[PDB]
UniProtKB/Swiss-Prot annotation, chain B:
GO biological process: translation
Keywords per UniProt: Ribonucleoprotein, Ribosomal protein, RNA-binding, rRNA-binding
Gene3D superfamilies: Ribosomal protein L22/L17 (3.90.470.10)
HAMAP family: Ribosomal_uL22_B (MF_01331_B)
Organism of derivation: Staphylococcus aureus (strain Mu3 / ATCC 700698)
Record family assignment: Belongs to the universal ribosomal protein uL22 family.
Function: This protein binds specifically to 23S rRNA; its binding is stimulated by other ribosomal proteins, e.g. L4, L17, and L20. It is important during the early stages of 50S assembly. It makes multiple contacts with different domains of the 23S rRNA in the assembled 50S subunit and ribosome. The globular domain of the protein is located near the polypeptide exit tunnel on the outside of the subunit, while an extended beta-hairpin is found that lines the wall of the exit tunnel in the center of the 70S ribosome.
Entries under PANTHER family matching the protein: CHLOROPLAST 50S RIBOSOMAL PROTEIN L22-RELATED, LARGE RIBOSOMAL SUBUNIT PROTEIN UL22M
Pfam families found in the cross-reference section: Ribosomal_L22
Name of the protein: Large ribosomal subunit protein uL22
Length: 50, 111, 121, 87, 44
RNA sequence: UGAGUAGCGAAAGACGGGUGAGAAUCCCGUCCACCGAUUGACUAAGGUUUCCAGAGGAAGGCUCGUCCGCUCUGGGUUAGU
RNA sequence: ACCGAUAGUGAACCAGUACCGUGAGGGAAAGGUGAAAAGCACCCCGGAAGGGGAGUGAAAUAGAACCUGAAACCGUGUGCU
């Protein structure tokens, strides 16, 4: 099926209310001192330290 | 005083870039450098450079210590696009767009 | 089975035979997350047999392992099956289960797939 | 007379040809019998055989204007005596 | 399927060649037009 | 605008070690799988430099690319039968 | 008391050409830095591309995608709702 009417700038900008990516949710490592992903290894130097 | 940096004619499309620019607009320098390094999107290795080189003008041309800086302006604009075609079924063709963007970051000491 | 790994039932069983064989000859590989949760259960069931050392035990292990030659021994070559009974089994006799450790790495370019590192303990 | 134009000094014409096999670049409307006479009058040697081959024009500069190079004719003389065809 | 154009070097020059068009009266008149328009090639 | 939507053109890959600013995709090694009156080896028409070596990564390649039938600089075809 | 780059010759721009067709045949698009190249030495971020300074110049928001630079369309901030 084809669209019957054009879509306005208003109705297009409401649809994308929810089209956004979220924060990666990271924490500082207690060696590197640099932000790392949770439950992963520090890329800068690898120390999981379970 | 504010130092700016531009990357003109990057090949990622503009409304793919805009998804990342939001996550950093308003954050702090060291926080912004870390978000662009732990995100899975494809515009991160390019946007990060434009930010790592706004901080090299914030200290070598002017004189500001790079710890107390915030990201004040971060937007992506349009660029000239490339025309391409892909042949479809039964002797017909359709166009393609290879879109381009300009990226811009301004860092400032809130003064 | 457990989970299908996105392959046909005959290719799925042919990959849990060649992945479980490199982990024995290398002892530290790097693969995808969902595969790793599948070779936790195939490897650690080859070690259990290797801790017996019967003849009916060896002739069950051989059904899985491939025939690869390990030439990095200082001089002689030792077949993989010889190295499951003669060396890996001796290292893990006191322990009861849990011969393997999994550590996540993060997303990987080109695919967004999750890397992991899985190592014999 | 002077049918020859210029020697050819490249790889494969430098060593495995170095010995009694000299490459010349000749006019595009001569036969091989004529080259067996011009080489003996210009250099005073004794020629064993001559081989010849022709090349087709190439496409030249992709950038800007497009065009063709020239066609050439490459000859190869083998000396039964003597040396010093080119230095 | 078997498309309509099956290339051939001998048959191209025996039908559309130069020595074909110079043989009949109506052919030398096709050269008189392509030459008056300024075409780059005369006889394809 | 439709919309970050349909599609990405029949088919088995896995790991280790290199190179690199950057690797599911490039190079080397082992194992596994597919064709085998053929997806193997020769030649006709036709195409007309697509062949090879060292460099290159804007465009083209339905993704990436350090790679290429793409780009730059030099090479390559020899007959008394 | 003709045109001024969608005009005037198809053609102010290597056009009867790029290309399209077995062939006869058809047939486009494309002008302007500055008075003068004086076409950005050197420094910094980056693999580069591209930028931020310093300089040339009367002017670089005149930097070769170069006078002026309208509308559709795409964004960033904000005063009332």
């Amino acid at each position: 099926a084809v669209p019957k009417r054009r879509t306005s700038k208003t109705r297009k900008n409401k649809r994308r209310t929810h089209f956004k990516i979220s924060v990666p949710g990271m924490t500082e490592c207690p060696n590197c001192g640099e932000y790392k992903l949770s439950h992963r290894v520090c890329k800068n130097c690898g120390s999981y330290n379970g | 005083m504010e130092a700016k940096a531009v990357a003109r004619t990057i090949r990622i499309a503009p409304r793919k870039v805009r998804l990342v620019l939001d996550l950093i607009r308003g954050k702090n320098a060291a926080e912004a450098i870390a978000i662009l390094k732990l995100t899975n999107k494809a515009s991160s290795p390019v946007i990060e450079k434009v930010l790592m080189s706004a901080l090299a003008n914030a200290e070598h041309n002017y004189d500001m210590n790079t710890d107390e800086l915030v990201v004040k302006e971060a937007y992506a604009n349009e660029g000239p696009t490339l025309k391409r075609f892909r042949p479809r079924a039964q002797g017909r063709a359709s166009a393609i767009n290879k879109r381009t963007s300009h990226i811009t970051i301004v860092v400032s000491d809130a003064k | 089975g457990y989970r299908k790994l996105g392959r046909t039932s005959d290719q799925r069983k042919a990959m849990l035979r060649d992945l479980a064989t490199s982990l024995i000859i290398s002892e530290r590989i790097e693969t995808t997350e969902a595969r790793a949760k599948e070779v936790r259960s195939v490897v650690e069931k080859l070690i259990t047999l290797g801790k017996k050392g019967d003849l009916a035990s060896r002739r069950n292990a051989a059904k899985t392992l491939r025939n690869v030659e390990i030439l990095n021994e200082d001089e002689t070559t030792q077949t993989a099956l010889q190295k499951l009974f003669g060396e890996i089994a001796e290292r893990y006799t006191e322990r009861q289960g849990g011969y393997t450790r999994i550590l996540k790495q993060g997303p990987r370019r080109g695919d967004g797939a999750e890397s992991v590192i899985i190592e014999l303990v | 007379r002077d049918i020859l134009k210029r020697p050819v000094i490249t790889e494969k014409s430098s060593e495995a040809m170095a010995e009694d096999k000299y490459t010349f670049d000749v006019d595009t409307r001569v036969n091989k019998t004529q080259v067996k006479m011009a080489v003996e009058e210009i250099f005073n040697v004794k020629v064993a055989s001559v081989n010849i081959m022709n090349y087709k024009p190439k496409k030249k500069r992709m950038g800007r204007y497009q065009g063709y190079t020239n066609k050439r004719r490459k000859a190869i003389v083998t000396l039964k005596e003597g040396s010093d065809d080119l230095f | 399927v078997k498309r309509t154009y099956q290339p051939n070097k001998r048959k191209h020059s025996k039908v559309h060649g130069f020595r074909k068009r110079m043989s009949t009266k109506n052919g030398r008149k096709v050269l008189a037009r392509r030459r008056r328009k300024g075409r780059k090639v005369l006889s394809a």
